[PDB]
Design a protein around this ligand. Structure first.
Ligand code: GUN
Ligand code: MG
Ligand code: MG
Ligand code: MG
Ligand code: MG
Ligand code: MG
Ligand code: MG
Ligand code: MG
Ligand code: MG
Ligand code: MG
Ligand code: MG
Ligand code: MG
Ligand code: MG
Ligand code: MG
Ligand code: MG
Ligand code: MG
Ligand code: MG
Ligand code: MG
Ligand code: MG
Ligand code: MG
Ligand code: MG
Ligand code: MG
Ligand code: MG
Ligand code: MG
Ligand code: MG
Ligand code: MG
Ligand code: MG
Ligand code: MG
Ligand code: MG
Ligand code: MG
Ligand code: MG
Ligand code: MG
Ligand code: MG
Ligand code: MG
Ligand code: MG
Ligand code: MG
Ligand code: MG
Ligand code: MG
Ligand code: MG
Ligand code: MG
Ligand code: MG
Ligand code: MG
Ligand code: MG
Ligand code: MG
Ligand code: MG
Ligand code: MG
Lengths: 123, 114, 209, 125, 56
RNA sequence: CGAUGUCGGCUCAUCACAUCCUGGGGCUGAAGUAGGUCCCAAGGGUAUGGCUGUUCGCCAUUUAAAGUGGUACGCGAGCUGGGUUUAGAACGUCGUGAGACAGUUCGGUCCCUAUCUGCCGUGGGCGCUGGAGAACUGAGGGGGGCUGCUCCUAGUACGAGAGGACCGGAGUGGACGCAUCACUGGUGUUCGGGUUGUCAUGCCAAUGGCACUGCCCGGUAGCUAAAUGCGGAAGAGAUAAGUGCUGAAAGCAUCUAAGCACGAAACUUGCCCCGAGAUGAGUUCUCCCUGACCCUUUAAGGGUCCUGAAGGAACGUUGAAGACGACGACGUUGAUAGGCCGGGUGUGUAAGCGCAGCGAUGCGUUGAGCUAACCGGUACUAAUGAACCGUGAGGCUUAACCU
RNA sequence: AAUUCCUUGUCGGGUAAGUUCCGACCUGCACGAAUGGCGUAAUGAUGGCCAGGCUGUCUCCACCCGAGACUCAGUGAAAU
RNA sequence: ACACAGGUGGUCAGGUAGAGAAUACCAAGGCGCUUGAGAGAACUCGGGUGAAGGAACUAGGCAAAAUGGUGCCGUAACUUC
RNA sequence: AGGACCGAACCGACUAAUGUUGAAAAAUUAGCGGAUGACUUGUGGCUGGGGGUGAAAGGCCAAUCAAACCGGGAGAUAGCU
């Protein structure tokens, strides 16, 4: 349950470390993004020699949130923080080449198959 | 109520083992893995139990890759295939929410042993 | 097709073989007993009137009792009509059970919604609150402007204002029928329906798809 | 809204209500009949009758529990020595409300509330 | 906010058209003491439904 | 001018249409995709931020779109008070000076308990022609009316290629709306526990008061959104712009003059709610009432005695109903409320005693004790036998049956 | 620039985006030396700008405890 | 002007905790403030708790939230030292 | 040592809410500044209206001071309402 100004950690080796959500994509007046949703981000901290830089403006898919995901029998899976994976602005495909921490099967899209394969763990 | 009670207990599992907050629990869950259907383990500490007949639930907490993962199970869901206690833990509270501020060495839980 | 009268028991869930939890309202539907058939010749329209339940003799007024006696049925907790379709036909004193829905895929459910008393515009009409701070004086959940100026010099009918909320007829449409069981007087529908536990419900096959 | 809630607020806060019914519950036990406003008399049953129920089983813990709810060892002593045994075999309803007038000074509806099998000797002593 | 015009004695009376009191219609007589009393209330001498329930 | 408060914002809106998006259509310098322009169309929908008092504007990022205008440049007896007309102060500039600026700068009191209209809700009265209880009919009124992306069709039509559809069908979302509390959660000063200082219950032990519920950790019922169900439609009628058929006036031609077929999110229906004060007060089923007298100005007259129904209401116990009224349940032939029993739930192993330890404390008895609004039961308490209103067969005329 | 009309000057920095801010330029409408000029550690309920923490300020409001509001009884105003 | 949350100089200084004349709880002493009873709607006032987010609010972080003791370790530019 | 630091009494009055036919003709609550000094305060004294006093705001001089209050010239004058 991510909105504008929200800060997210980063679940890849893109070099970003902290990003801010500056837009929830996918509809007029849309309020929140959750696991599986794409956001627009600015990069607030990045490592020295990575694929991206501080102040760069791009997209990312949310892959872990504190609000969690509901499953069909009523269950909940919650994470201790909010993380995302950086995506090319145009192709919306991953910038990084590795993924860190657990992800959820909600990502099983044509689009995010690469993220679940790379993920250490899939919940 | 009777009607509901009766609708609810014909759906209730009969062999839920006994476990309690602070115990370490392994829950085996049914999942669809691409085009497969298999059991997947999820092991962690019981930090909360909701006793409510058919609507019973419990929250299991574990550490994956430095960061916490909490899973709330609906005890009577057919998604939950089995539950087994891996170790019996000694705590006083019913709800161990304080463990969320603790990590590694601080978050350990003595063994009950009795 | 006709509908039936029932009682809202409460909500619970059905778990499915493959992990879905269906939330269900439990509706109690006892036999509906037909207390008057209306036809074109006598009434100008076609309909059955039904009762269901049971009622305390000492609470059944004489007018009420003559009407029941006429149909040859015991008193029930009330009377409700259901319009008939061409070819639909019933007879006085006939019993209609919940198996009427056996092969109805969805139903509309009508109830009297819970009462929230006198409600302010924030809750009743989702108005937004003005500032909690920044100098606001005595005006946080209050309604704001209720009109323009000299032209029109009046407040318009329909203006959203505070007043009674709930305790009214509400129909919720196209709920899935999850189970029908006449031996237990049960109908389970997927989802929430209007009303408090205990209150009457009208169930009709869905007018939509 | 108030749906399905119990407990009268009596234009008091929570700690005042509790001190008040603690006093009023002692008054009833001591005198076996008192007069108060109809709504306080009706709330009071919910405080005095669980005391009498408790007193049906004499034990240190039940005495202490009653002491904690009354803070008056004369009252707990009468509960466990006299009232517990009186009502040994009565399944509840140890009190009775008798409606009476309207108070002169503010027109409050009044009532007597008394212990069911009332002792007039106890009342005068 | 205050009136621009003085309301009439007519209007005052209309406003008051719901102010009249209701006389009590449910007095009973205790069958033992002979006292009048509000229904479901005790009598002044402390009788109720024929029993002396309160010495006072 | 014996006062009509100014810009902008917030809240709440309402109308126009010169239409921003969605819908229909003609032309295109329209291959497709995507555009341009005009016509028809007002049903719904129509962005968050950075800067600035800003409106506007530039900028960032969204969106199907981020419309233009009227409403005292809508809206201060609804809020704000940043801009802007008071008094303080300073800078530049002008003036000998007091001072001035339509230059700038820091600071700088926003009242009103709603009588009438209006509006949102909710009652009382009477009426509807004897009275009464229900169930209705449906005139009229209101609500709703938005849309993305993906897939199949189809890598098809089109195209040198790059790309890439119409028509039609499936799915899944954004915003919005209603309902609900089963799930996930919030709250839960009425449940349980831990704990600091102090005071008391004689003391130990156990408890209670006060200190924001002293401070906290949890949490039942209820309420509730972030939770999870459902909705917008399809269909039908008549149309707009527009497309045509047959066809003269006018040997031809012509959608039109006669005749005929189509045609849109607008209109009428279809969906939801109110609804017979619809005084044009409607319909259906059922229930209740079967005594005399007097008087005058003799008439739909006035009164008296006897009667007092159906029903309504009153009183009481009350409700997921409620400001009050109202509305629902119940009143001993009784579960209406309280208690009480059992259960659940929550808390998390009480007290006492015993053991271990110098002691703090640990262990056992023990998943103990306590447990609200919950579930299932139970007449222990309280719901009185009765009085109040409402009557006593219901107008005239004509017609149709029947005497 | 507490001084600059043109003006949101231009350039640089910070921000995803900065009419404010900081640094620089000089084209000073209309700075300038006790009408004191330019600096200045410390001080300041002083003006402008930024960040961490924090949060019901806000997205967007929910529940709860209390005093009113509502009902009964007693007293009993006001502006107009 | 009121039996009015205002104003009014000096003196005295008990117990526990505490640096204290702060603060909390008490003692001696003095009081519950001269309309009460119910109810448990909107809205207003004064408070408590709050999922995810965390200044996105606004002229402006206004108001809230937060920090908060003692001891020791440690502490930058700049400086009139 | 100090117009030194933190902080009650005491002196003040930066912000906000409330109140605005108030509890109050300037307050109340939560916060705020000074607190050995150019400090604060009791009693009494002196300065008087074109006059006083003013760390200067045209501030204050008995609840409205760019000329106090009372009485008088006085029925000032009012080409205005
Ligand atoms: N006491 C009493 N009981 C009833 N039961 C049904 N109606 C009534 C009534 O009016 N009074
Ligand atoms: Mg009905
Ligand atoms: Mg209600
Ligand atoms: Mg807002
Ligand atoms: Mg104010
Ligand atoms: Mg306020
Ligand atoms: Mg106005
Ligand atoms: Mg007019
Ligand atoms: Mg009161
Ligand atoms: Mg307290
Ligand atoms: Mg208790
Ligand atoms: Mg005037
Ligand atoms: Mg047009
Ligand atoms: Mg043109
Ligand atoms: Mg429009
Ligand atoms: Mg665009
Ligand atoms: Mg205007
Ligand atoms: Mg105002
Ligand atoms: Mg100006
Ligand atoms: Mg009709
Ligand atoms: Mg002790
Ligand atoms: Mg009706
Ligand atoms: Mg033990
Ligand atoms: Mg129990
Ligand atoms: Mg007669
Ligand atoms: Mg900023
Ligand atoms: Mg500069
Ligand atoms: Mg100073
Ligand atoms: Mg309240
Ligand atoms: Mg009164
Ligand atoms: Mg007084
Ligand atoms: Mg005083
Ligand atoms: Mg003190
Ligand atoms: Mg929060
Ligand atoms: Mg949190
Ligand atoms: Mg943060
Ligand atoms: Mg901002
Ligand atoms: Mg803004
Ligand atoms: Mg502040
Ligand atoms: Mg604070
Ligand atoms: Mg000093
Ligand atoms: Mg103060
Ligand atoms: Mg100080
Ligand atoms: Mg003096
Ligand atoms: Mg003269
Ligand atoms: Mg004169």
């Amino acid at each position: 349950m991510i909105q504008e100004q929200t800060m997210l950690n980063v679940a890849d080796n893109s070099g970003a470390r902290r990003v801010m959500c500056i837009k929830v994509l996918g509809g007029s007046h849309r309020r929140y993004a959750g696991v599986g949703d794409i956001i627009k981000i600015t990069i607030k901290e990045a490592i020295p020699r990575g694929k991206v830089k501080k102040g760069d403006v791009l997209k990312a898919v949310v892959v872990r949130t504190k609000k969690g995901v509901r499953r069909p029998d009523g269950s909940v899976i919650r994470f201790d923080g909010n993380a995302c994976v950086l995506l090319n602005n145009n192709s919306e495909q991953p910038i990084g080449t590795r993924i860190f921490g657990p992800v959820t099967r909600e990502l099983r899209s044509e689009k995010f198959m690469k993220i679940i394969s790379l993920a250490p763990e899939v919940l | 109520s009777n009607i509901i009670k009766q609708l609810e207990q014909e759906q209730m599992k009969q062999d839920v083992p006994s476990f309690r907050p602070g115990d370490t629990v392994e829950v085996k869950v049914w999942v669809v893995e691409g085009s497969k259907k298999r059991l997947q383990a999820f092991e962690g500490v019981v930090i909360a139990i909701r006793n409510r007949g058919l609507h019973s639930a419990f929250t299991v907490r574990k550490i994956s890759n430095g960061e916490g993962v909490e899973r709330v199970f609906q005890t009577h869901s057919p998604v939950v295939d089995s539950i087994s206690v891996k170790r019996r833990g000694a705590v006083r509270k019913a709800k161990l929410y304080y463990l969320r501020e603790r990590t590694g060495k601080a978050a350990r839980i003595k063994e009950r042993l009795n | 097709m006709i509908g039936l009268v029932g009682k809202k028991v409460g909500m619970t869930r059905i778990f499915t073989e493959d992990g879905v939890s269906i939330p269900v309202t439990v509706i109690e539907v006892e036999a509906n007993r037909v207390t008057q058939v209306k036809d074109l010749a006598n009434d100008g329209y076609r309909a059955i009137q039904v009762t269901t339940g049971a009622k305390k003799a000492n609470r059944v007024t004489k007018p009420e009792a003559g009407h029941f006696a006429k149909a040859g049925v015991e008193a029930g907790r009330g009377l409700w009509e259901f319009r008939l379709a061409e070819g639909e036909e019933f007879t006085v004193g006939q019993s209609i059970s919940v198996e009427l829905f056996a092969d109805v895929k969805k139903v509309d459910v009508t109830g009297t919604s819970k009462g929230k008393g006198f409600a302010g515009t924030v809750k009743r009409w989702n108005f937004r609150t003005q500032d909690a701070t920044h100098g606001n004086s005595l005006s946080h959940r209050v309604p704001g402007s209720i009109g323009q100026n000299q032209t029109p010099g009046k407040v318009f009918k329909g203006k959203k204002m505070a007043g009674q909320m709930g305790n009214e007829r509400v129909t919720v449409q196209s709920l899935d029928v999850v189970r029908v069981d006449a031996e237990r007087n049960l109908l389970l529908v997927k989802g929430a329906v209007p009303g408090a536990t205990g209150s009457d419900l009208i169930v009709k096959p869905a007018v939509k798809a | 809204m108030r749906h399905r809630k119990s407990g009268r607020q009596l234009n008091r806060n929570s700690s005042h209500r509790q001190a008040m019914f603690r006093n009023m519950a002692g008054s009833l036990v001591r005198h076996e009949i008192i007069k108060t406003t109809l709504p306080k008399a009706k709330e009071l049953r919910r405080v005095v009758e669980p005391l009498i129920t408790l007193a049906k089983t004499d034990s240190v813990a039940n005495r202490r529990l009653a002491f904690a709810r009354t803070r008056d060892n004369e009252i707990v002593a009468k509960l466990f020595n006299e009232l517990g045994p009186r009502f040994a075999s009565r399944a509840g309803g140890y009190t009775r409300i008798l409606k009476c007038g309207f108070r002169a000074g503010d027109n409050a509806p009044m009532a007597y509330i008394e212990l069911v099998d009332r002792s007039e000797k106890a009342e005068a002593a | 906010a205050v009136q621009q015009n003085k309301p009439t004695r007519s209007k005052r009376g209309m406003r008051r058209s719901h102010d009249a009191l209701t006389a009590v219609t449910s007095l009973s007589v205790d069958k033992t003491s002979g006292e009048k009393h509000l229904r479901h209330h005790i009598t002044a001498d402390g009788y109720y439904r024929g029993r002396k329930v309160i010495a006072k």
